[PDB]
Amino acid sequence: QLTEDQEVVLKQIWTHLFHLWQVPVDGTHIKIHKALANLDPQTTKKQFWHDIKNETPDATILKFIRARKWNADKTIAMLGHDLYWRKDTINKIINGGERAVYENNETGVIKNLELQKATIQGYDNDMRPVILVRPRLHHSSDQTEQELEKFSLLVIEQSKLFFKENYPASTTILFDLNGFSMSNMDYAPVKFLITCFEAHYPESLGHLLIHKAPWIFNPIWNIIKNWLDPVVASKIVFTKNIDELHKFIQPQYIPRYLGGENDNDLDHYTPPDGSLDVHLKDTETRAMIEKEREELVEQFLTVTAQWIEHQPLNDPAYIQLQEKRVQLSTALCENYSKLDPYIRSRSVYDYNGSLKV
Numbered sequence: 001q002l003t004e005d006q007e008v009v010l011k012q013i014w015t016h017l018f019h020l021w022q023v024p025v026d027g028t029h030i031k032i033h034k035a036l037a038n039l040d041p042q043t044t045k046k047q048f049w050h051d052i053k054n055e056t057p058d059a060t061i062l063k064f065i066r067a068r069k070w071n072a073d074k075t076i077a078m079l080g081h082d083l084y085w086r087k088d089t090i091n092k093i094i095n096g097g098e099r100a101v102y103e104n105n106e107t108g109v110i111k112n113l114e115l116q117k118a119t120i121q122g123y124d125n126d127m128r129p130v131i132l133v134r135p136r137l138h139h140s141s142d143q144t145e146q147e148l149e150k151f152s153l154l155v156i157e158q159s160k161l162f163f164k165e166n167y168p169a170s171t172t173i174l175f176d177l178n179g180f181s182m183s184n185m186d187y188a189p190v191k192f193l194i195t196c197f198e199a200h201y202p203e204s205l206g207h208l209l210i211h212k213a214p215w216i217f218n219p220i221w222n223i224i225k226n227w228l229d230p231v232v233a234s235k236i237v238f239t240k241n242i243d244e245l246h247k248f249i250q251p252q253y254i255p256r257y258l259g260g261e262n263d264n265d266l267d268h269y270t271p272p273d274g275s276l277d278v279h280l281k282d283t284e285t286r287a288m289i290e291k292e293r294e295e296l297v298e299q300f301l302t303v304t305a306q307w308i309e310h311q312p313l314n315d316p317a318y319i320q321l322q323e324k325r326v327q328l329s330t331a332l333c334e335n336y337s338k339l340d341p342y343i344r345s346r347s348v349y350d351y352n353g354s355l356k357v
């Protein structure tokens with residue numbers, strides 16, 4: 001649960017959003033903000049509620065709030081920035097999946113997929129999804145930076161779908177530097193991935209494991225550490241053997257070649273053959289799932305305004321507003337689970353059994 005002055009912050013964030021979306025609310029008892037005055041109401045509302053998939057609305061907003069240390073103005077500024085930069089580009093990326101990338105012959109993206117440069121390999125000890133990155137497979141010439149970035153965004157988004165109920169909604173990254181050479185170094189995607197987690201995926205990082213760093217990496221590290229904010233810097237751990245990795249990941253999830261028990265094929269990529277995509281063009285059922293969502297979003301907005309202006313926080317009526325918000329939250333996440341087979345092309349992880357939405 002949340003404290004009173006925390007509840008106030010969360011309500012003020014919702015109130016700024018509601019003034020942008022023309023949802024009637026009175027914020028006095030707990031005129032569009034500068035951060036939102038240059039956004040399109042319709043576009044923002046629609047994109048915001050598409051990007052909510054498996055997380056409740058409150059949790060999605062609270063990620064931005066904590067990342068900005070519970071300062072309401074800074075939180076609404078970061079959130080407006082994100083909404084401006086996201087539009088519908090990332091949702092298109094995750095919904096088209098690897099299939100769209102192949103169908104439109106995006107050669108650089110494809111080479112990153114086929115090299116298995118970044119792959120979700122299971123969960124860490126807190127049930128966060130774990131991304132295995134192997135920089136020794138990287139060559140700046142293999143792709144454009146835009147392709148590299150589109151691939152990175154796709155992998156990040158995929159790992160968001162692995163987030164478990166009642167477990168931290170964040171991704172751990174294992175950087176295996178075995179066989180890393182300057183041949184492989186590329187400061188540009190480092191910078192992008194620092195910049196993009198900082199402004200677009202608040203509170204989405206769990207652990208940053210840097211495994212068997214060779215000596216040539218220490219000067220590079222002296223640069224990269226300068227670019228990090230202190231919380232991301234707090235997340236980084238250097239490990240040198242499998243016993244150290246064991247403290248963060250269960251042996252069933254660590255690749256065999258690292259000392260673990262995971263016998264996944266890391267040298268041969270198996271793209272999604274598309275045979276689980278049958279619901280992608282049941283258009284009418286999709287439309288009925290999306291109408292359910294539209295109604296559940298309207299109700300959520302309604303009750304959330306109610307809960308914003310209601311005084312006091314003792315009240316039995318307040319108890320009912322809170323419980324209704326939680327049940328509408330639950331209903332929205334279940335509705336997204338139902339909608340998932342109908343908008344999203346299946347990933348290699350839906351096929352190999354590892355992912356269930």
Ligand SMILES: CC(C)=CCC/C(C)=C\CC/C(C)=C/CC/C=C(\C)CC/C=C(\C)CCC=C(C)C
Pocket residue numbers: 117118131133134135138148151152153155156173175177184185186189190193194197208210224232236
């Ligand atoms: C999804 C993902 C993380 C990867 C996309 C593909 C890329 C960018 C892989 C290549 C990585 C690379 C070329 C690195 C060279 C050596 C550098 C490092 C191991 C340090 C880079 C990582 C960091 C520790 C930066 C700060 C952390 C984050 C993620 C914000």
